[PDB]
Amino acid sequence: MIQGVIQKIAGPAVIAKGMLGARMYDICKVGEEGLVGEIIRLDGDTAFVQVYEDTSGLKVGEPVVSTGLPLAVELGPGMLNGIYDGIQRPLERIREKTGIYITRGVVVHALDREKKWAWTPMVKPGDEVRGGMVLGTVPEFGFTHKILVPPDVRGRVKEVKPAGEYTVEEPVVVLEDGTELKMYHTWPVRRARPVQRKLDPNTPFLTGMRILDVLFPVAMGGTAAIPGPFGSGKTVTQQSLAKWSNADVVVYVGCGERGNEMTDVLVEFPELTDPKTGGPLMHRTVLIANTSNMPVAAREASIYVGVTIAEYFRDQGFSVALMADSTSRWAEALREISSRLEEMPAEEGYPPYLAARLAAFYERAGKVITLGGEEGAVTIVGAVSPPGGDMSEPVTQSTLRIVGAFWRLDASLAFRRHFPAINWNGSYSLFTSALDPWYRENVAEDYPELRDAISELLQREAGLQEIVQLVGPDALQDAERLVIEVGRIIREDFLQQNAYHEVDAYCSMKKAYGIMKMILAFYKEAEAAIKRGVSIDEILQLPVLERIGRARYVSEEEFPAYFEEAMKEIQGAFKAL
Amino acid sequence: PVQRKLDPNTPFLTGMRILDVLFPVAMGGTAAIPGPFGSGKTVTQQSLAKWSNADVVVYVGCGERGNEMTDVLVEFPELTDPKTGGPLMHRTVLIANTSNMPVAAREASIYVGVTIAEYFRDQGFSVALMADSTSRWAEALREISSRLEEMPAEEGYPPYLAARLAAFYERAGKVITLGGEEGAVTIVGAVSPPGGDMSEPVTQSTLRIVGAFWRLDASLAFRRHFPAINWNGSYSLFTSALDPWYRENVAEDYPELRDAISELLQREAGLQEIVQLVGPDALQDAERLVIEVGRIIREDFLQQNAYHEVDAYCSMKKAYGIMKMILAFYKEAEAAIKRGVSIDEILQLPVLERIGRARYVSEEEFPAYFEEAMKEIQGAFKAL
Amino acid sequence: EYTGITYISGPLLFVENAKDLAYGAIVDIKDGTGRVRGGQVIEVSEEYAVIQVFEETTGLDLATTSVSLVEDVARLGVSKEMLGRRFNGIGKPIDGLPPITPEKRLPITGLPLNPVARRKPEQFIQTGISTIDVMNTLVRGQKLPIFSGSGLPANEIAAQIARQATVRPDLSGEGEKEEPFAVVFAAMGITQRELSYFIQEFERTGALSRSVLFLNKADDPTIERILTPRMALTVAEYLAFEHDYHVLVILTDMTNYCEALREIGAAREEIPGRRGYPGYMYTDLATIYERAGVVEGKKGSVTQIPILSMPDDDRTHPIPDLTGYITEGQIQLSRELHRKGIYPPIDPLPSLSRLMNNGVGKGKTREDHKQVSDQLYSAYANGVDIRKLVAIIGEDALTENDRRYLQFADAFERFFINQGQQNRSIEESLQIAWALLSMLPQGELKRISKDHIGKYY
Amino acid sequence: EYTGITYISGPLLFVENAKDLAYGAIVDIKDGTGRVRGGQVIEVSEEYAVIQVFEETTGLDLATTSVSLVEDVARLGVSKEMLGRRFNGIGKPIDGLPPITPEKRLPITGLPLNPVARRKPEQFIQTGISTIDVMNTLVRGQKLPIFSGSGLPANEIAAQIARQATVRPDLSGEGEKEEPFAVVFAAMGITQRELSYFIQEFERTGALSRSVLFLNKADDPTIERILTPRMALTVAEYLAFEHDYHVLVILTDMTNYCEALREIGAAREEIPGRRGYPGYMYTDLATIYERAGVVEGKKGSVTQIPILSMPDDDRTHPIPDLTGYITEGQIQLSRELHRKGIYPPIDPLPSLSRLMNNGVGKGKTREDHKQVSDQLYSAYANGVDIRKLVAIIGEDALTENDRRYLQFADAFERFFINQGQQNRSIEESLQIAWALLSMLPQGELKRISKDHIGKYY
Amino acid sequence: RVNALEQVVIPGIRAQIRFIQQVLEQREREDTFRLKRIKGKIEAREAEEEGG
Numbered sequence A: 001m002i003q004g005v006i007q008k009i010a011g012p013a014v015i016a017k018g019m020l021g022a023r024m025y026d027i028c029k030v031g032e033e034g035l036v037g038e039i040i041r042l043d044g045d046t047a048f049v050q051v052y053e054d055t056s057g058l059k060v061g062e063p064v065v066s067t068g069l070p071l072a073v074e075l076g077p078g079m080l081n082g083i084y085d086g087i088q089r090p091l092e093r094i095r096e097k098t099g100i101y102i103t104r105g106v107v108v109h110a111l112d113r114e115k116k117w118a119w120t121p122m123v124k125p126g127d128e129v130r131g132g133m134v135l136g137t138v139p140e141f142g143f144t145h146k147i148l149v150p151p152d153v154r155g156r157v158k159e160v161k162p163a164g165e166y167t168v169e170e171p172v173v174v175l176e177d178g179t180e181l182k183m184y185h186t187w188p189v190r191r192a193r194p195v196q197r198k199l200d201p202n203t204p205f206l207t208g209m210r211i212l213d214v215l216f217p218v219a220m221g222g223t224a225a226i227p228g229p230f231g232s233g234k235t236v237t238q239q240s241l242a243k244w245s246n247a248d249v250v251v252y253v254g255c256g257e258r259g260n261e262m263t264d265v266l267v268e269f270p271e272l273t274d275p276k277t278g279g280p281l282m283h284r285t286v287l288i289a290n291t292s293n294m295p296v297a298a299r300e301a302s303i304y305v306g307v308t309i310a311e312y313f314r315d316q317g318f319s320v321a322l323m324a325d326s327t328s329r330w331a332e333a334l335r336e337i338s339s340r341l342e343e344m345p346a347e348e349g350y351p352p353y354l355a356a357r358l359a360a361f362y363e364r365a366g367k368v369i370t371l372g373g374e375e376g377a378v379t380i381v382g383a384v385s386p387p388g389g390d391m392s393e394p395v396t397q398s399t400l401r402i403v404g405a406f407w408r409l410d411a412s413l414a415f416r417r418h419f420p421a422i423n424w425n426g427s428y429s430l431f432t433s434a435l436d437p438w439y440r441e442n443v444a445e446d447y448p449e450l451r452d453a454i455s456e457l458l459q460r461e462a463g464l465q466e467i468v469q470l471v472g473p474d475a476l477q478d479a480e481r482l483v484i485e486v487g488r489i490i491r492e493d494f495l496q497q498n499a500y501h502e503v504d505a506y507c508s509m510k511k512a513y514g515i516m517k518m519i520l521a522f523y524k525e526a527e528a529a530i531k532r533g534v535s536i537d538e539i540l541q542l543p544v545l546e547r548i549g550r551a552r553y554v555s556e557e558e559f560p561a562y563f564e565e566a567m568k569e570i571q572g573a574f575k576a577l
Numbered sequence B: 001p002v003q004r005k006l007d008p009n010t011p012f013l014t015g016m017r018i019l020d021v022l023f024p025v026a027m028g029g030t031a032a033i034p035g036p037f038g039s040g041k042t043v044t045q046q047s048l049a050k051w052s053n054a055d056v057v058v059y060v061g062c063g064e065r066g067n068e069m070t071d072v073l074v075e076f077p078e079l080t081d082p083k084t085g086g087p088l089m090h091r092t093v094l095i096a097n098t099s100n101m102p103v104a105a106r107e108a109s110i111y112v113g114v115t116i117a118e119y120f121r122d123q124g125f126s127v128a129l130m131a132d133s134t135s136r137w138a139e140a141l142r143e144i145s146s147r148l149e150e151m152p153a154e155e156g157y158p159p160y161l162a163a164r165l166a167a168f169y170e171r172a173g174k175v176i177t178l179g180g181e182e183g184a185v186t187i188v189g190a191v192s193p194p195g196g197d198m199s200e201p202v203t204q205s206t207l208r209i210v211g212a213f214w215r216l217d218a219s220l221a222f223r224r225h226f227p228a229i230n231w232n233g234s235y236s237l238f239t240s241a242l243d244p245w246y247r248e249n250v251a252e253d254y255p256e257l258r259d260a261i262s263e264l265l266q267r268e269a270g271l272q273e274i275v276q277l278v279g280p281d282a283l284q285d286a287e288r289l290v291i292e293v294g295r296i297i298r299e300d301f302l303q304q305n306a307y308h309e310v311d312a313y314c315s316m317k318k319a320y321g322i323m324k325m326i327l328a329f330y331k332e333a334e335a336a337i338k339r340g341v342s343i344d345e346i347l348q349l350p351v352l353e354r355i356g357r358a359r360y361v362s363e364e365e366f367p368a369y370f371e372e373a374m375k376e377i378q379g380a381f382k383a384l
Numbered sequence C, D: 001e002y003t004g005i006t007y008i009s010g011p012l013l014f015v016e017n018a019k020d021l022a023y024g025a026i027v028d029i030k031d032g033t034g035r036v037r038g039g040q041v042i043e044v045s046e047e048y049a050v051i052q053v054f055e056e057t058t059g060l061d062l063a064t065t066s067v068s069l070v071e072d073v074a075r076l077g078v079s080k081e082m083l084g085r086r087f088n089g090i091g092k093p094i095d096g097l098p099p100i101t102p103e104k105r106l107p108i109t110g111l112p113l114n115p116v117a118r119r120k121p122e123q124f125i126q127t128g129i130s131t132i133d134v135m136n137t138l139v140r141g142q143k144l145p146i147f148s149g150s151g152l153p154a155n156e157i158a159a160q161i162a163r164q165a166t167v168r169p170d171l172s173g174e175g176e177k178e179e180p181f182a183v184v185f186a187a188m189g190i191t192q193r194e195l196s197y198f199i200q201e202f203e204r205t206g207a208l209s210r211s212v213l214f215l216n217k218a219d220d221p222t223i224e225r226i227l228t229p230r231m232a233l234t235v236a237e238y239l240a241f242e243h244d245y246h247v248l249v250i251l252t253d254m255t256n257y258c259e260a261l262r263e264i265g266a267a268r269e270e271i272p273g274r275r276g277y278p279g280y281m282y283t284d285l286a287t288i289y290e291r292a293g294v295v296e297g298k299k300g301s302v303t304q305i306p307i308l309s310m311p312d313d314d315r316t317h318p319i320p321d322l323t324g325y326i327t328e329g330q331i332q333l334s335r336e337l338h339r340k341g342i343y344p345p346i347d348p349l350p351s352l353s354r355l356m357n358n359g360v361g362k363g364k365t366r367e368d369h370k371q372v373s374d375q376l377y378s379a380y381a382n383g384v385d386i387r388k389l390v391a392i393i394g395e396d397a398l399t400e401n402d403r404r405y406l407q408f409a410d411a412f413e414r415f416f417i418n419q420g421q422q423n424r425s426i427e428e429s430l431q432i433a434w435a436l437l438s439m440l441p442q443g444e445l446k447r448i449s450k451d452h453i454g455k456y457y
Numbered sequence E: 001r002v003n004a005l006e007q008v009v010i011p012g013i014r015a016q017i018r019f020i021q022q023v024l025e026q027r028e029r030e031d032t033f034r035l036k037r038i039k040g041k042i043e044a045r046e047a048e049e050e051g052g
């Protein structure tokens, strides 16, 4: 790195000097404490001092030391089960060495140098390795956590220690070069991981949400996004996402998430049933949450911090599932750069690095097979937080065209009885088209048929919806309340899913699939009931109708037979009347 | 200097039927005067100085144009003095501000007023201040911001918004002065929304730290609704500290029957929409009750000529007074028209016209029709 | 000593001769009239730096201007010694009673707290009223600011709590063994009428007791609108967390905040960002509001939920924007009811807090509650919904069933919000709820379960 | 090749002695590691110059920053040797095949030709569809816009009919001697997913074996992105315009065209006039729909096709306004259409090629097409009335004559418009219309003449 | 309704748009005002860099 001191003192960002080759985007050291800095601009010998955490204790002329390379995040076993800031720093150790509040200057290894993880070397001493290839099988609960050779560190193994217990610092694998392929490997964050090759997304992802995997699903590692006004459950709506749903590897990180909006999964995620390892989901989960009041710049680390961890696992063929708690806060920090940097304001009052850091970052990792052996994909969804909630905010469009299957969050939606609280129409999906393969077989060869003919109504029903807001049930004819109510119940019990209920929090195919038929029947029988002449009036108070709405609460176990019993009462308590 | 501040106590009523009756205020506190162009504001000050509550009379028309005060100023010399009889100048002083006064000659012209009120107040005399269109003065500072390169805030305006304003309101109020004698400094600023701009900040932040405000409908100003005030969006908080003097001199069954009247036009809206959507006839008997009720609750109350020797002045006697005349109709018409007879016969009631002199009647010879017809209400109408 | 002056004009100062200083330092400002001031060492520079005066530099001149670095970072007193005393924005004797010695001067700034100290606001309290203690139910550690317009019952009703605020241990499990109450009021631009009305609510409730506040009356310089907050929010962290005082603190007249906030946005040199307000506003309102939440390992929880007023019914106002996110939950106020009669007039059409749903219903409270609140919510929604279509098509035009929907709207609202000095206990609530739901038997109630549903039918 | 770099912003870089350079240039820059990147030549003033690094940025140092002068203006090599090649953004060999044979290094922007030469494009053209060839065809050189939805089946319906297109001079009375088929497609800001859905269509059936690719992902560098289109755009010219071949230019979501734009001004200081975008888009954008038309003497004509999505499907934005101003047509897609399953979900009147109304009929395509083209238009939409009026009276509640105008619409959207991947020859496409028209007894159509209907019908 | 629609409906929503609009178009206040000041800085910096 470079060796110098503070040249020109300034508010929270100062100006260092004696800087030579201080390449753009480089970690450094400032202040006689550890307020690590970053080269975020250059001017001959001086470089714009970057300060991550707030600075209220520093003087004119203090630490200024770079690296020479683009940062360096230390990846390796021992990162699981434990709190870690947007800088891979375990706050656990902080609370344990400081007190009740968060003291600065305290920074310890992000990997377990102390702890001895039973390492198992299977590298034949006499061959050449390549950054991205497996190094063995490490014990870490009900899952598999290999150790990738740091990329470009391709040399020639020469020895292999016994299968016992070796820390992420001890020699676990050696090569002919004076190097050692420990359980950990150094890798920059601003740079992605060279995988084997690019792969197509044809496998749908499931999380229990009957509004995604049902009709509005994405990919086994594609890209997506969902807004959220001031308090729209978007923060907590990340609980039953990785916990309930399957996720090769969970990775939660949020930009400046209001301490109170961040303490929603902090202790809850801990007691989460895990269908693979067993106990708390905290077995594979990383937890990279970042409170707002957190260093305004930490709010930035958070992101570029969870992006690479998702990769380090994905390459090995791990469909890492990362979710950003309100991706919008990153923006308030990112554009905040301008204020402190007096940079020529870009368009839309926001910074210029729109695409540069939007699409690049929003597509860094996504369903990619690599040297690992398996196919590692990446599914992440930043929930934009539009201040006024305005759907045309920089962050709204800025994410558009970039990530498919967009969704909207209304205000009275979740406040009322709708959950999830998203826009009906305003939320469409294009991945569901090629998402049929997996569905066709898993669900049924005609499933995309029973699901497309229904969306037919959910979106066609509007045909009347509109006239409704133009007159109401007054001039209703016979097809009228047909649809209206249909779609109506369809959202009260069919769409709204109590993610906070016993089991309903999750629903499989046979679950999602069946129900979508429950009503259908009535519809079918409704078509000949009223058409034959039956007055919708008695049709309205059909007791069996009340049965079709108690299907959401049923579990995958009871469900099967449960619905089939009413499927009979239907044609019977209708065709009759 | 004021020994110590003091809460609201003495009521403040200029002699306006509604203005006073609905949103009265005390010596401690202020209120703004909304209203685009032509909006009573610019000369209402000519309706609030002539006859009202207070001893001294001080008027500082901030950034007021020439004619927006031409007659106003010269008219004062014609006013009546409750003490001597001649123009109000026999105890008043003009602190007006001409539009053409430079920006700085307007951004201070006002501070002169309130600081005068205190001197007199500091001696134990209640002082009244009422600045017309304060949108002029504003602009004054509201502009200097551009001049010296100040850095604007919300909606293209200077950052020093309610900065001084807020404090100006505090000083306002009846406060025992460290001058031995308490006194009574009352403040009332008239914020004029240029283009009928409600969204206006001088209007949105003004009532952030102040008492209450009086919204003047631009449209209402048309049917001689002097003052061009409006209830739709007009509320009053100083109407909870004036009840003591209310039921103390006027009467006890007044501070209540009054409240029971606002509902008239209150509950009246919800009907109005459809009322105007279909026809003023598709209602049941109890429906038409408040149908043409409200119309009078104004026609002969809200609608007053600030220039009519009689009407132009209506104190509490004129208030509660006629305030009961209609009441009767309520209790009367509700059964009278409920006796099989349709209200139509009640619509011709030549007896209504008499109550129509509730404002055209001599402020002195007022109790002449008060009690007189008072009976004619519960009597002749006791038959149907 | 720093006399080498360079620039004076407004709450903004500038001076050279200071090649040493850090961010945030309390200095003084000797004037020519013999009137000194404080001043924070904002952004510092080599040759000179930026000064922060508290009050407006009236009759000040550079030549005779004198500053004095007193401290390198702010602190002020912080002991619970001065309980019940009166102070101002800053935080010093302004009531007449002689000064006193504190414990240790600490930066009331409001630094961030560990993730272990954060928790779930399950410890519900009695808000002395139903509206709250059911739908939103108070919770120590959460944040549900109060949206207001102008003149709205932001202050009047706010008091309803000053007389109807008390936890309900008996229902839960813990007893009144280790639960001290200590309030830390902090004003920022308050009227004159608003001054005494408040205090008079301290003598009738018994609030004037155990109160260590920093009142910032409106006539106070706008220097303390965002500054006092940090001062007060910290007089808690010391008695609440290390002394175990479950100290609940809330700010008033936060309508003036963003104003002082705004100034820095551009009146300084930085970029506004949005709606004419400082780019970093989000954060400046994070360290403050983030100082909310219960604490494990230490029985000391601070609940923050100030009250910001926004011109006209503006929900997208610069204020509610990030504040919504920031604050866990929220509460909304309607003018329509505060001008028609409904008093207290309070309605959270969109307010539905955050972690109010998890913290009551099983154990402490009554079995039925979890599905109840959610029940009442959509249950009512469907109602007023026709409040419009009604005023359009006709009067009775509508099916005989939904007729009930609207037929009850006026009911629920009129009645429910027709609360008064009513202490409304956690229970007195539940009841009413079951009394209004009775207008349509188990049929539309698709939120609660069949048992509970009839349970209180 | 100098050094001493002062003032660096993101992928920008300044360098002194810029009197050897000139705006409109680019050269590869090398920091310390000597890594070869790039940068455009802007503001070549006396003091310093302005360069824009190809990549994002990381890799610029203070010490070294020499630069290898590439060429004021660089341009890819043109030639007929590109009948399946593949390139991205800038357009560099990624298809694996050998660097394209450079014929002439023409500027990626040769600006418009002599306006006196330009002629009215009227050579009828099929696309393997009915509705998009009958009611609205596309004439050679005709720049036809396509209002798509930002998240609609666009990406698909795009490349779907892409290959379907097929020029038919035969029906006019000529061969394919001077009328060759050249397919050029260039996108930008594409998802890694989509970047793969594209490459698929070409490989399908003899598609890539006669076309070249170009598409700068949105995650890629923002520099080539903008120009990205201009590349093959300027290159198509050498095809139909230089040799007399027949090219088809097809834009793709100009979302990029503008997003990318913002950066240029956002840095260049280019103040954004309306809608927060550069006060000179019309112009710069104009130069776009100009590369299409015809000259006096040359039969070779390239047909131009714009295709983009709005922010929220707002035509008040530039993305739509601009086009809807220079483009000679209009063709959008509605949520409705597609919701029911219609594919391609393309409305009726809302979509239409302004200048395809003359290059059809006699001589061109199907003589009777003349009136056939304006038949199904006014006749079809006519039914769209009894389409939302069911709830009024009902099915049989309506007259026979007008009710009949109903069944048509349904059999029209479901079968007539939704034609998916099918490829209907220009002739197989015209028939359908007739077929549908049979609904109404010969004598109800007031659009076409009894002569034509009394035959084809 | 026709009538009404025509004087409250139609005109009700008409009048809305204007208010919005005029605020929306001027909204570009910050554009000029913010940027105006912006030039002075970027250039003052490059204007005082050629004088020092």
Ligand SMILES: Nc1ncnc2c1ncn2[C@@H]1O[C@H](COP(=O)(O)OP(=O)(O)O)[C@@H](O)[C@H]1O
Binding pocket: A228, A229, A230, A231, A232, A233, A234, A235, A236, A237, A261, A326, A383, A385, A414, A419, A420, A421, A499, C325, C328, C329, C353, C354, C355, C356, C357
């Ligand atoms: N699945 C859900 N269903 C209903 N409410 C939810 C759901 N998830 C979260 N919420 C609620 O939404 C509230 C506000 O959203 P939050 O996530 O805190 O803000 P944001 O995500 O917008 O930044 C939470 O307080 C919680 O009560």
Ligand SMILES: Nc1ncnc2c1ncn2[C@@H]1O[C@H](COP(=O)(O)OP(=O)(O)O)[C@@H](O)[C@H]1O
Binding pocket: B035, B036, B037, B038, B039, B040, B041, B042, B043, B044, B045, B047, B068, B133, B221, B225, B226, B227, B228, B306
């Ligand atoms: N309250 C009032 N309402 C309507 N007109 C008034 C009122 N008071 C006075 N006027 C008449 O209208 C003139 C101007 O009214 P005012 O609203 O005071 O001025 P402005 O035009 O500035 O609104 C007065 O000089 C007088 O002739």
